[PDB]
Amino acid sequence: KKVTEDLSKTLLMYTVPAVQGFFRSISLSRGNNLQDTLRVLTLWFDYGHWPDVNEALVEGVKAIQIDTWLQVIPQLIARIDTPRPLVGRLIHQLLTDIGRYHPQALIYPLTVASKSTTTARHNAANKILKNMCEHSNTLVQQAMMVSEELIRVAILWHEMWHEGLEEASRLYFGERNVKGMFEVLEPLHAMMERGPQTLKETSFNQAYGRDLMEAQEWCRKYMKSGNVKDLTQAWDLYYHVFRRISKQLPQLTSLELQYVSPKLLMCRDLELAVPGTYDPNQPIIRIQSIAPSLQVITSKQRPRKLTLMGSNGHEFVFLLKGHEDLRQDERVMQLFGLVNTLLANDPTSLRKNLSIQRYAVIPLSTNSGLIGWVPHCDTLHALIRDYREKKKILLNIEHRIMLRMAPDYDHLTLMQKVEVFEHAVNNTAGDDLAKLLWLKSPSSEVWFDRRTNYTRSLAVMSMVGYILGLGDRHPSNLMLDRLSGKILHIDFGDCFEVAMTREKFPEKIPFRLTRMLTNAMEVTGLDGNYRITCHTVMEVLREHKDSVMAVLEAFVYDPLLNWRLMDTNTALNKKAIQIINRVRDKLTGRDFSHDDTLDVPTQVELLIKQATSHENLCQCYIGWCPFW
Amino acid sequence: VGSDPVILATAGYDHTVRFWQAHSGICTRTVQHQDSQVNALEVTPDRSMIAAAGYQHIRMYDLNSNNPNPIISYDGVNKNIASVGFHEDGRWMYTGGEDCTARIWDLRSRNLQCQRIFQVNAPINCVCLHPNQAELIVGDQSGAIHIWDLKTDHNEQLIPEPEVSITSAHIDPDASYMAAVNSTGNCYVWNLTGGIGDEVTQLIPKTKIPAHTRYALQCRFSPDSTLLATCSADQTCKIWRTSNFSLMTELSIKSGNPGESSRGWMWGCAFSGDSQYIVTASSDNLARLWCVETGEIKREYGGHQKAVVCLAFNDSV
Amino acid sequence: STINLQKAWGAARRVSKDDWLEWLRRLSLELLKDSSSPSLRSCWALAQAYNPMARDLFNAAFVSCWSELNEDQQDELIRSIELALTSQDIAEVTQTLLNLAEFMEHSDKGPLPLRDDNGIVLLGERAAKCRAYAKALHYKELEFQKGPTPAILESLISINNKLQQPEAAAGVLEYAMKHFGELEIQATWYEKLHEWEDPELMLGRMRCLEALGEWGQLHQQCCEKWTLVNDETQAKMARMAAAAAWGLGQWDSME
């Protein structure tokens, strides 16, 4: 170890003025300092358990403004423990500096900190909660108490135990018995019997529960017996109550909030600022009251529409959902703070108003949280349907022209797939979108402005999408603002190149550009306004790599994001570094070929051609609307 | 059926294999592929038998029996089998198919498994005849002209125009010239050059052919080797003098009106008589029989339920 | 029945701005009084008492009578209306009828005909000369749908500058190199473009040379060309020639 240690401590002599000039620059500036904030916290989490690294860090930690750490509350609640001895021990205290000055910011993250499955986090949480309780006038006790109502209602027990039951038949079958009946079905009924048989309206929740119970008896008999009669009894009884549930999940819509939970609705005018919307630079806007009934969106996931009165008279609208922890999304929206700040530095970027539309993300479990309900927005998918349906054009004509030319489409050769795709495309107009945007808009003078803002906001996320690797761009995963014409984006489940990896219909695309969008842009096509907006953004990125690469490297290497990445893709640190290596190919023009440095114009031209291959397009799945 | 000295063999996208006594103007028998899209059809030049190939499958049948079922079957290349031929004596089948593993298969005895394998990084996009029957011409999704010895992997892997999958190739019947075809719309012709050492062929460049706007599909010689045809997604078959591989005459279905462009993406050509006739896989509902050099349309056959995928032919022993 | 259309058919003898504005208002009053809607038939009283809100009700009143015209009554009224624009460019009624046409374009009546061809060019010209550059741009986009010409591009490009969009004008030139090929007409127009950008040979360069300020070569050019030429060509270049002399400190030459 001595060779790498001597190197690491001669490196630490370099780290000393690195850290010092970082801290004094972090004193001298705001915003951009976050690159430095990340890097010092990084080298600390990397190597801080040596006392000689602790020397460089601790004096600067103890001689820099609190506001520094308000930049990293989520990035620092991520690994709230950071378990290595003097590292975690000092970070516990450092988080209780925010847990002295600014509890209204920290308290949602401290709610998150409560309910780790593994021990480590839960312990740092209980320490830091009760360190903060006195420093914060027992605000913690009010806020955790309130949040505990919301956490329980959040994936309201009924839809969960229904879905677990429907899943359980699709688990026990064949010979893998435990996965369905044993594991789901008794814990399910136990978690009706405590939970919604008490902290929801007992009897009517028990309206399903009382037939789920008689199937549960036969299930409990089978669990221990192994008598194959108990199995078929348990299943047939479950099929009967499942069939009752099967008719009612389709037609619940709006739900009285105390019947959603009798403690919910009833809290008022709190010691809490509105859910992570607020910040301590402003006078408080406080949770005052709640919408009387919360509303299941008519979708496969069944999220709840909500709104909260703030003490300032505003209403703040949220969508309550969960099948993954929103932190991953939060960190994607956090990076957009930086990219917006880059475009705000350059005079021509600034003059042309360029930015990404970030939106509010508030995680509350491994599954769930609140998402900000954006106003004024419709999916790109819905609008095409509206236009076609209102005109009484046959909705999905293009797939039908393909099948009528050849029903064999999906197993044709390369060039035959292309030929039939070209034929169905050439037999169909490709500009419904251009028409509906004009029709919808009031008058030409507004419409021209809208077309411009549409074009530019599309161009911006053409570049950041391509840098990130982002895919799954079917038009039900795109959204449009009906006042400005700005585009908006709504899923990031697979950010990196792995969209190209998907085995059946690989998303063989750098970013989505397509005939209805291009035909909705100017009659000139993309050269001029679009192409030049692409150049300016890529120049600004080609330049400020130290900022963007720091945020990327920090996020992408992260030992806890590595479990999100084992859910996304795939130590993984190597694949993470390979992604950063490929980003550094995109830096130069080595992305097209590993030998080459290319100018921005040449890089963009090759990128456009990659985004217009007929072959790639008719290797998206037909449900991706590659005809549009 | 099989006794006729001139037989037309075909499929539509409907993939049913349609066999015409060529003089007749009727599909005299039909073999009902409705499992998998046809990817090649391969009647023996001896007029006796056919290997019929499609997605995941090849099967072996006679020409003289009415609507036959598989006498031998071939399976496991669970991909598009874009080209099929033989060890020319009829001992083995050869297949270019879009698994990473092209194959030699038994026609000496009943076997479903391949007699041998050729393995490549990128899956296999085309094949052609090679006269020694100690190598095979192979082409693929790496764009590499894998002329390949049948056991050693002594191989050519040449790429004349950069990177792209080579869509087809063919040899001179007298094996002095070889033409290689690409998705970029082009063909490149290289002089066949010989080595007894190792077990592998050599190529030297001859002619550069930017033949079409649209993607170049297939080429074939007249039986006298005097002409080489080349044909495309572009709706026309251009005929070259073998001497310098430049234009004699052209037979075209380039549409009378652009209201119906792709009257057909003609999927290549074959010949009949002593270079009297040229035939095309015309990608219209017609399989199309024409005269060479005169360039003129003689008989056309509409029996396919969907438009033509492939043309296979006999006017030979 | 037809008194409505007769009050537009006075278009044979409306001459002054007030004649056509009086025609528009008294027409509106007859459209209201014989409208398909009982509501509007009362609103006719207010419209008489107070014209500014009649400007509004007119658009509805128009649909309310225009649905009750068959092809003859349509053609009859169409002519009196296309004659309102055709007679004169009068900005008031021009902008008003442009909004009325645009209102029809959003309507499911379709666009009104005006001298065939959905009025596209008449509307375009009228809009352009009314400084309403976005509406003019919309009609020029619409002509480009009915097939391109070099004259369309050399119209369109000025509209993009009249609306302050340099990158859009750059797009049209880029289009004109790839759609139209190296079309030798536009390939000449690289020296008809306002920027230097790599007597039309003499002054149709000196404009560019004194914009750039290639002061040495510009001084030689101005000295040479001014001493050579003898017409309004001397007068039109004398800016660049005094400017060159100034740039060179030649106070004697400058006069």
Residue numbers in the entry:
A (entry chain B): 1867 to 2436, 2492 to 2549
B (entry chain E): 8 to 324
C (entry chain B): 1261 to 1458, 1474 to 1530
Authors' description from the paper:
The mammalian/mechanistic target of rapamycin complex 1 (mTORC1) is a large (~1 MDa) multiprotein complex consisting of two copies of three subunits: the evolutionary conserved Serine/Threonine protein kinase mTOR (a member of the phosphoinositide-3-kinase-related kinases superfamily of protein kinases, PIKKs), RAPTOR and mLST8. mTORC1 senses and integrates inputs originating from nutrients, growth factor signaling pathways, oxidative stress, and cellular energy levels. Two endogenous negative regulators of mTORC1 activity have been identified to date: DEPTOR (DEP-domain containing mTOR-interacting protein), which also inhibits mTORC2, and PRAS40 (proline-rich Akt substrate of 40 kDa). DEPTOR is a 46 kDa protein that consists of three distinct and highly conserved regions (from N- to C-terminus): two tandem DEP domains (a DEPt), an unstructured linker of ~100 residues (residues 228–323, which we have named long-linker) and a C-terminal PDZ domain. Our structural and functional analysis of reconstituted mTORC1 inhibition by DEPTOR revealed a unique bipartite binding mechanism, involving an interaction of the DEPTOR PDZ with the FAT domain of mTOR and the DEPTOR long-linker interaction with the FRB.
A similar reduction in DEPTOR IC50 was observed for the cancer-associated mTOR mutant A1459P. The cancer-associated mutant A1459P is in the middle of a helix fα12 at the major intra-FAT hinge, and our cryo-EM structure of the A1459P mutant bound to DEPTOR (global resolution 4.7 Å) shows this helix becomes disordered (residues 1457–1470). The structure of mutant mTORC1 bound to DEPTOR reveals a widening of the cleft between the mTOR N-heat and the PDZ-bound FAT domain, relative to this cleft in the structure of DEPTOR bound to wild-type mTORC1. Consistent with this proposal, we observe fast on/off kinetics for PDZ binding to the mTORC1 mutant A1459P with a Kd of 0.6 µM determined by SPR. Structurally, the interaction of DEPTOR PDZ with the FAT domain does not seem to be significantly altered between mutant and wild-type mTORC1. This underlines the need for a bipartite interaction for effective mTORC1 inhibition by DEPTOR.
